[model samples]
Target: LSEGEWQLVLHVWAKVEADVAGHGQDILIRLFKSHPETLEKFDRCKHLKTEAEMKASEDLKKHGVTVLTALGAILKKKGHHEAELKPLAQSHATKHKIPIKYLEFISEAIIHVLHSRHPGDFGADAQGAMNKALELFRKDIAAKYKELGYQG
Candidate 1:
């Protein structure tokens, strides 16, 4: 992303950081609801067959925070230090067997949750910047997966 876009992304993130856990949990809930199959990859969440169950799952909440924390780390670097995702990529590709498609799905869910939470601040430009950042995330994970010989 360009300098201006990075600034906008950080600006939006400033608003999001205040309630990272809430937003992160909402994103995961939305993702699981939209793509039920994706939940199967999450051993901690796979048993949550209902939205209410998922919402009440402590493991789900902790994992949501973990996801947002990792995302926050990348955004904190403005998409430059994507190598931080390597360990997560390895686990997803080898241990969890997550498909590349779920990355895009989660990205969409994140954007949607952000917009829903802060419609006024998460404008088109900010959304676009966030999307670009997520694209970098997707590429980084997929590249690591490829390096590990995980076709999915």
Candidate 2:
């Protein structure tokens, strides 16, 4: 995804979360459509159309964002949100590395994951935002990644 699309994803995901609640079914549909491999890898024998399954799925996805702080929370495992965040925060506090202020931008990363998974009605918007946001954020991460020789 382009940098603009990433930013747009963050803008909308961070903002449009509540609205997305109603689009649960559509979200899963779009999610699987884009990331069929994810579900397939997990053995999705349960019917995606089952009302209970869809509701549960939506609830789980939404909770992931609300349960954590910004987008970094999503990167680490649940309950490990703080654990994942501390190092990044400390990097700034201790060494003036990478600037903790920009951690807020991780919300854009969360948005990218969501938009990428469920590219339905918001698919176009997701792509645009992801492109824009990623353009800005990716540069930051890429520089870091490059330093580590981990550029993908």
What local lDDT does model 2 show for residue 93? Answer: 40
Mark the regions of model 2 whose C-alpha exceeds 4 Å error after superposition: 1-14, 17-29, 38-55, 58-69, 72-130
| Candidate 1: tens digits of C-alpha lDDT, residues 1-152 | 99999888888888878988787789999999999888887666677888788778888888888998888888888777756887888888998888889889999999999899888888999999999999988888888899999988
lDDT of 2 by residue, 1-152 (tens): 44454455555555445554443334444444454433432234335655467566744456343433344333223222444444444444445333322333333444445665565735767565544443444345444544544423
Q: Against the true structure, what is each candidate's TM-score?
A: 0.93, 0.34
Clashes of 1: 0
Q: What C-alpha lDDT, on a 0 to 100 scale, does residue 36 get in candidate 2?
A: 44
lDDT of each: 0.86, 0.44
lDDT value, residue 88 of candidate 1: 87
Give residue 101's error in model 1 in angstroms: 0.2
